[PDB]
Amino acid sequence: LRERTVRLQYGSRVEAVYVLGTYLWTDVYSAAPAGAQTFSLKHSEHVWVEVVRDGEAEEVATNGKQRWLLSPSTTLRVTMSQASTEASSDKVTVNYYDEEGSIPIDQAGLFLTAIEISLDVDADRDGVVEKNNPKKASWTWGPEGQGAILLVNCDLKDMSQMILRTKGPDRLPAGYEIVLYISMSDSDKVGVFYVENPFFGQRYIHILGRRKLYHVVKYTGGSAELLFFVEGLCFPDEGFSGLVSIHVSLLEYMAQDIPLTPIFTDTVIFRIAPWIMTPNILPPVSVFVCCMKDNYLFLKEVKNLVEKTNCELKVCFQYLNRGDRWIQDEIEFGYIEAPHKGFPVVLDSPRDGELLGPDFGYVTRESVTSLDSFGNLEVSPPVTVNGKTYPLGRILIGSSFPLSGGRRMTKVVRDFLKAQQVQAPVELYSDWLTVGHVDEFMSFVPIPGTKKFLLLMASTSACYKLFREKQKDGHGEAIMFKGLGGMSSKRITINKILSNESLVQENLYFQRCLDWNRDILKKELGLTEQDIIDLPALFKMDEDHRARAFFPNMVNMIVLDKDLGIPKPFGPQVEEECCLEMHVRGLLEPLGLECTFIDDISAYHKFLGEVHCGTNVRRKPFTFKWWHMVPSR
Amino acid sequence: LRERTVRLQYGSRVEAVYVLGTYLWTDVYSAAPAGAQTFSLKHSEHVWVEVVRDGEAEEVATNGKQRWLLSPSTTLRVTMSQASTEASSDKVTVNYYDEEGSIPIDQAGLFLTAIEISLDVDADRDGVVEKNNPKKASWTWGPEGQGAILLVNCDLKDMSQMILRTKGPDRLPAGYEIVLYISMSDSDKVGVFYVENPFFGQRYIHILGRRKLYHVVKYTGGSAELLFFVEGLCFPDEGFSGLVSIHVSLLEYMAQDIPLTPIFTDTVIFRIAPWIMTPNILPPVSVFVCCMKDNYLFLKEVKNLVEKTNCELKVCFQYLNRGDRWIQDEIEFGYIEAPHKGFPVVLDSPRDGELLGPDFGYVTRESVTSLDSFGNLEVSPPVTVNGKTYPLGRILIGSSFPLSGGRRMTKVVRDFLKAQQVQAPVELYSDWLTVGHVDEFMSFVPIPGTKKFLLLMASTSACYKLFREKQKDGHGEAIMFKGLGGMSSKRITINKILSNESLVQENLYFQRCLDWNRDILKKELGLTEQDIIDLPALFKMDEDHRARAFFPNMVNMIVLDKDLGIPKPFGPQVEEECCLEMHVRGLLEPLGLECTFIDDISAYHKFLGEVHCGTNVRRKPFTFKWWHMVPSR
Ligand SMILES: [Ca+2]
Ligand SMILES: [Ca+2]
Ligand SMILES: [Ca+2]
Ligand SMILES: [Ca+2]
Numbered sequence A, B: 001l002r003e004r005t006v007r008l009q010y011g012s013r014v015e016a017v018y019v020l021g022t023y024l025w026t027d028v029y030s031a032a033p034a035g036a037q038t039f040s041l042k043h044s045e046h047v048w049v050e051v052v053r054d055g056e057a058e059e060v061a062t063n064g065k066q067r068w069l070l071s072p073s074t075t076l077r078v079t080m081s082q083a084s085t086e087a088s089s090d091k092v093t094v095n096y097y098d099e100e101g102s103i104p105i106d107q108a109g110l111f112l113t114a115i116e117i118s119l120d121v122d123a124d125r126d127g128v129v130e131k132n133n134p135k136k137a138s139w140t141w142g143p144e145g146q147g148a149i150l151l152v153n154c155d156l157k158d159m160s161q162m163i164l165r166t167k168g169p170d171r172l173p174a175g176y177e178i179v180l181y182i183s184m185s186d187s188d189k190v191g192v193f194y195v196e197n198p199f200f201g202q203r204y205i206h207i208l209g210r211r212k213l214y215h216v217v218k219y220t221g222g223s224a225e226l227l228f229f230v231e232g233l234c235f236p237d238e239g240f241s242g243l244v245s246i247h248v249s250l251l252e253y254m255a256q257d258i259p260l261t262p263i264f265t266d267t268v269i270f271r272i273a274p275w276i277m278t279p280n281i282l283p284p285v286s287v288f289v290c291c292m293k294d295n296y297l298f299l300k301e302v303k304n305l306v307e308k309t310n311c312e313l314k315v316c317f318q319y320l321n322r323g324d325r326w327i328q329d330e331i332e333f334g335y336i337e338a339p340h341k342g343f344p345v346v347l348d349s350p351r352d353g354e355l356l357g358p359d360f361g362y363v364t365r366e367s368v369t370s371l372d373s374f375g376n377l378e379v380s381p382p383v384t385v386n387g388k389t390y391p392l393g394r395i396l397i398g399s400s401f402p403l404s405g406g407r408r409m410t411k412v413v414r415d416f417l418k419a420q421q422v423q424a425p426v427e428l429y430s431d432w433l434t435v436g437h438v439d440e441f442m443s444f445v446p447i448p449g450t451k452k453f454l455l456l457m458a459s460t461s462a463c464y465k466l467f468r469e470k471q472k473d474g475h476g477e478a479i480m481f482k483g484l485g486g487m488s489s490k491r492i493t494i495n496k497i498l499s500n501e502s503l504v505q506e507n508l509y510f511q512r513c514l515d516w517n518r519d520i521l522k523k524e525l526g527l528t529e530q531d532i533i534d535l536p537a538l539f540k541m542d543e544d545h546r547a548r549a550f551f552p553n554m555v556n557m558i559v560l561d562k563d564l565g566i567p568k569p570f571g572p573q574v575e576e577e578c579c580l581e582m583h584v585r586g587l588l589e590p591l592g593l594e595c596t597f598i599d600d601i602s603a604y605h606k607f608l609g610e611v612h613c614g615t616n617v618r619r620k621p622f623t624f625k626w627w628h629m630v631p632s633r
Helices: A296-306 A411-420 A460-475 A485-490 A494-498 A501-525 A579-591 B296-306 B411-420 B460-475 B485-490 B494-498 B501-525 B579-591
Strands: A002-005 A013-019 A022-026 A038-043 A048-053 A056-059 A074-079 A090-097 A106-120 A148-150 A160-168 A176-181 A190-194 A205-208 A214-217 A222-232 A243-252 A261-272 A284-290 A312-316 A331-337 A342-348 A361-364 A377-379 A383-385 A388-390 A395-399 A426-429 A442-446 A453-459 A532-536 A539-541 A547-549 A558-560 A563-567 A594-598 A614-619 B002-005 B013-019 B022-026 B038-043 B048-053 B056-059 B074-079 B090-097 B106-120 B148-150 B160-168 B176-181 B190-194 B205-208 B214-217 B222-232 B243-252 B261-272 B284-290 B312-316 B331-337 B342-348 B361-364 B377-379 B383-385 B388-390 B395-399 B426-429 B442-446 B453-459 B532-536 B539-541 B547-549 B558-560 B563-567 B594-598 B614-619
Touching: A002 B501, A013 A022, A013 A243, A013 A261, A038 A048, A074 A090, A106 A243, A106 A261, A148 A160, A148 A222, A160 A176, A176 A205, A190 A243, A205 A214, A222 A261, A284 A296, A284 A558, A296 A312, A296 A558, A296 A563, A296 A594, A331 A614, A383 A501, A395 A411, A426 A501, A442 A558, A453 A460, A453 A501, A460 A494, A460 A501, A460 A532, A460 A579, A501 A539, A501 A547, A501 B002, A532 A579, A558 A614, A579 A594, B013 B022, B013 B243, B013 B261, B038 B048, B074 B090, B106 B243, B106 B261, B148 B160, B148 B222, B160 B176, B176 B205, B190 B243, B205 B214, B222 B261, B284 B296, B284 B558, B296 B312, B296 B558, B296 B563, B296 B594, B331 B614, B383 B501, B395 B411, B426 B501, B442 B558, B453 B460, B453 B501, B460 B494, B460 B501, B460 B532, B460 B579, B501 B539, B501 B547, B532 B579, B558 B614, B579 B594
Parallel strands: A002 A022, A013 A106, A148 A261, A284 A312, A342 A361, A395 A426, A453 A532, A563 A594, B002 B022, B013 B106, B148 B261, B284 B312, B342 B361, B395 B426, B453 B532, B563 B594
Antiparallel strands: A022 A074, A038 A090, A048 A056, A048 A074, A090 A106, A106 A160, A160 A222, A176 A214, A176 A243, A190 A205, A190 A222, A243 A261, A284 A614, A331 A342, A377 A395, A383 A388, A442 A453, A539 A547, A558 A563, B022 B074, B038 B090, B048 B056, B048 B074, B090 B106, B106 B160, B160 B222, B176 B214, B176 B243, B190 B205, B190 B222, B243 B261, B284 B614, B331 B342, B377 B395, B383 B388, B442 B453, B539 B547, B558 B563
């Protein structure tokens, strides 16, 4: 396919390595002695030679006596299809003649050693390293796309394989060597491991990476394969697309103090697999919770919920360097996948700077507000938006309005999420909340028995409507926070809430904030009102004009398929049941969702807007392969 | 198209601005008094109202008595198609009823003011700003692609136009304002100009850009248009794609110390036009030359060449802050184009840190080797490579091998050229040359009477073949450098050159360097041997093992269509003509190329490998529009 220039040298022999998959064009005119008129040629069995004049080519026999006029426009094309062995003498010889006699006045030779050199990866994405995929030097998205995929080492049987395959005689001819190399830029993105001395053992050493840009490879004769393992060192990010290159070159020695000439180069491209987040609709595997040792109702009720499922429960306690919610706030469960292998990968952002066990990879963060917590990071189910499908869903991050001067998640984390590309992040407005997390106002739940889902939204208007109804019904004196002794002296009733004029105005405003988010979610997730259910919520404004929960936010719930762990609201008691619990059941249960209310606050005797427990669910990855997506340019 | 949430408020009136191109979904259930059972509605002439229950919608008359059951799943959809005027009373009123009587127990209203707000650009790329192109919020490549294009101000009638078009009543309702804005990131990429006080004059002020991220716009009633002019501040580069965004928002006042809510936002995208280089095949306009005042033969011969064409000649002399070749080395002629306008743009990189006149834009550079000179920057004619078309050609930059430790053009300039994208740069190997410029070894020329072109390559093998022929013919004592008195004592003859064994070896090596480039050029430009002509050249090796010209390099030539200004080689005289001149004529003239040899060295009495003049040709731009290309992702 690729034409390489090799000229005969005046009255001499040229020796050259021929790399299979290329061919040579050979100038015979320049090596012709002055006064020479015509030329003839001989060649060996395994070398194919054409005489090319003005673009027109004719094959030549091994020993012909045929002669052609010498012209700069008459050249040779030289091709080989099989590697040289010790039995080979591969050559082309050209005889030169003057006008007078038929005995050659001079001759120029070309002696060839043919070798196969191919740097191979699994570009067709089946988990096997195929021989010389013609597409291995590029990377394309989609079901028809090709090029190899690399996993970040988040901690070598599970790394990517790269195989240098060669075929040839006992040794390379004098003056050649084979070198593997990478660019300085890619040197902090990858590393490559190799057994340098296979005669002395199995020991794999790092041959390419930080501080090592090239490695000279030992040539072995016959048909040989050299196995390399490759790891990614980092995820795609603001200035890094995820694509890296590795090269092998056959180098020719020229002279001392002159660099070696790269006479053949083969290239493979890898893309580093992105970090992917799992939405609530995916099958649960493990439920992780953190709380204080004595919150007994919480642990018992979570255990009972989990016992309704096939999931395993993992209990963590509170640590000195972490928040009360850390399993929710400082940890996010995600995954990476390559054709051959995949594993769960946790983003870890410790408050002050344990874990899950060996089955997980970990990405730990190297100015920060509450909006940096992973409570502020959510992901939608797969959605179609104006005809465009997002098969992995879309990441949702809470923010403030552009002109507001409000809080925002750090650019570093936003840039990281954006750079993964396959979840196409969307910013929502969370900064009207004191804590500032999207998970305080919204969640997703599957609809049992279907492939569909609902968006759940906190609604203050729903709460006021319900409370007004109960008051009309004669329940105005129904008290909230039953069983929280630290709330009792406040004597909070439906009447007291409904009569508070400033609280009404605060909550109308918070409903405007919720509705602004509702509109962004409908637009960017392609949802209609039929896809949404509102759950009652109520907030109190702080000094910053931001919202804190008046009673526990029910929307932030543990979703295990049909079973929902819902924070216990401690609402007004009507006929000895919480009217908030009954209302929420009436909304959800007709859909086949099973509700379990989980009391995370009783142990503290009161509720001031802060939650002291956290939960996080590890889920099975999407069955859709991320490399089958086609993201926008 | 876009659904916006507007809820009725319990027993009250809500007033809202309606922006045309959206519609409202309206909750009536939350505003219902406790105990209310059914509702009815009235609406004005220009407001369309549907009652929506469980996804099913039915239009409602202006005054109906129809009643519907109150349910959270029964809502209103509210649409307007025309802007409000002073004659409008646009409203929807909802009456609430209990089980008992038919007289309403309460009512909630919605009072609307409809306005049109559209931020408009020329997205369809015809030079006119069309009304609200649905595609203005994106940017796509190709003949079917859309989105607006911005020119860099390289120095406002020629800037891009952006028009804010509004329609509505005499004033915005209380609590609203319209604001134009950009991101902090884009603030150094753009600037926007506006007449802030049209009553006091025509004065245009900078309203958005560095240090100004937002501008409050004055609303005028009726049908109004506000004209803005937009400029790009910089070209695409390593961390900047070329894409920028400008937004207009309608903001709602909530309260003191609470940020304004962006209730409607419209966005336009601009792409900043790339800098594009012109190949030798494009029509010449002006020829620029620099030399010392007394190089008379040079000026006379260049003038005579130019007089064979319709081109204009511009003569520059030597300056203290610049090189002897500066018009070639420190200046590169290129262009930018937008649908409405285009102009030539010069890259200027002064050696130590005049010009062309007002018709040109200038980009001046803010560690450096010879490879940074623009002699080391070339561009191919349009080419097709493995089925992929490069309609603007491909930029060529000289470099050294990856593992060599050799010189390279600075990353800053390489990154810039790559970031323009439309010329898809290719690196060649120039570092075997002392000066290190691709223009020392290669050039392109059209084939007269056709749409085709040739690559010209320097060849040492061609020179040795020619000299060997002349020696065989009895011309061995023919002397070179005739008329250069400072060379005479050297007595350089064909015999003396051919007998120098080390010089032969040096030049065989230089031919290997040339051939390595030949192979890259054939591969990356999709050329065959039929596309190439070799011209004789000869070099001498320096202490760094790099090549300097033995006699002037003929390949670096002035190409004006069929007419070629070729450096005079001062070769061996045979029958009182230079055998190099005669040889080159014999190669080129049969193709209809007319050769004029230009003596740039006689004034210096000798030639040591350095050229003391420079030339550069300004050309007409490609007729193919760059935005019609589709570059690789
Ligand atoms: Ca494979
Ligand atoms: Ca989260
Ligand atoms: Ca237009
Ligand atoms: Ca140039």
